Amino acid sequence: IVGGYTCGANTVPYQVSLNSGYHFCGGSLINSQWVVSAAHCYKSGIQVRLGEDNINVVEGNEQFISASKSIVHPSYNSETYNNDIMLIKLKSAASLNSRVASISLPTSCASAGTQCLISGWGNTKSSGTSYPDVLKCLKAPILSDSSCKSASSFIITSNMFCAGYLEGGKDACQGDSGGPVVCSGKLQGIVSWGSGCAQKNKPGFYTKLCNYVSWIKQTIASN
Numbered sequence: 001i002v003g004g005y006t007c008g009a010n011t012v013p014y015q016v017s018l019n020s021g022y023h024f025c026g027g028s029l030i031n032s033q034w035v036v037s038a039a040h041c042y043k044s045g046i047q048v049r050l051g052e053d054n055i056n057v058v059e060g061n062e063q064f065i066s067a068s069k070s071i072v073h074p075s076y077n078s079e080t081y082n083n084d085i086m087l088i089k090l091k092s093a094a095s096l097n098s099r100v101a102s103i104s105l106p107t108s109c110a111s112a113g114t115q116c117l118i119s120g121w122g123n124t125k126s127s128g129t130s131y132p133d134v135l136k137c138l139k140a141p142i143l144s145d146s147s148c149k150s151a152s153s154f155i156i157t158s159n160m161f162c163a164g165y166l167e168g169g170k171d172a173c174q175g176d177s178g179g180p181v182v183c184s185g186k187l188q189g190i191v192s193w194g195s196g197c198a199q200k201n202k203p204g205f206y207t208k209l210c211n212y213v214s215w216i217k218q219t220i221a222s223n
């Protein structure tokens with residue numbers, strides 16, 4: 001997260017760190033046994049880390065739980081990033097409390113202009129790299145489809161939205177991948193991709209989670 005702020009320990013209780021020996025992606029706890037993340041974060045040997053603030057220090061509220069199953073969206077396209085969403089089932093249910101909490105799935109898509117909270121342990125620099133150990137947060141408005149389209153050399157789909165600030169300086173970044181974009185208490189987005197980080201006219205792109213609610217509920221129900 002570039003140009004954001006330190007969230008505060010466990011102020012984003014649905015935020016998860018996916019760990020394969022090191023933090024590699026964020027994700028969002030959507031119930032006691034399931035995490036949603038980006039399909040581009042897929043890899044084997046995932047441990048889900050809940051209750052994290054400082055990902056390098058055991059501070060007493062973590063729950064570490066290995067994934068028993070990952071399910072990349074059936075139509076995830078890694079070339080176009082279409083359908084960049086993955087579900088991860090935990091080997092055992094997380095214990096939910098104030099510091100570990102699920103985030104609600106949306107029932108309606110969010111509209112342009114809506115302010116959202118994006119969080120993660122991704123790179124904090126627009127040029128070069130510095131990775132924070134505590135969770136970073138950024139409030140960013142969803143941008144219009146027209147400006148998202150104008151802002152990207154890549155084909156954008158209806159399963160993506162962009163959010164951020166065209167003037168640059170504030171954006172998600174590498175390492176925030178898979179993490180939540182929450183708008184009005186609903187998980188509306190997943191950190192998906194961007195061209196560089198926090199560059200002028202290059203806003204972050206996010207998987208439009210409201211489009212996947214049926215797949216998500218059906219997949220969880222059947223697994």
Ligand SMILES: CC(=N)N1CCC(Oc2ccc(N(Cc3ccc4ccc(C(=N)N)cc4c3)S(=O)(=O)CC(=O)O)cc2)CC1
Nearest residue numbers: 079080081154171172173174192193194196197198204205
């Ligand atoms: C839309 C599309 N067709 N895509 C997505 C973009 C591109 O794929 C990628 C995927 C990953 C990267 N990486 C950077 C990267 C990764 C994740 C991000 C998440 C958000 C944001 C943002 N600003 N909100 C920028 C990000 C930039 S990379 O793999 O780490 C390159 C490397 O190895 O150093 C760079 C390009 C090509 C495929």
Ligand SMILES: [Ca+2]
Nearest residue numbers: 054057058059
């Ligand atoms: Ca910790």
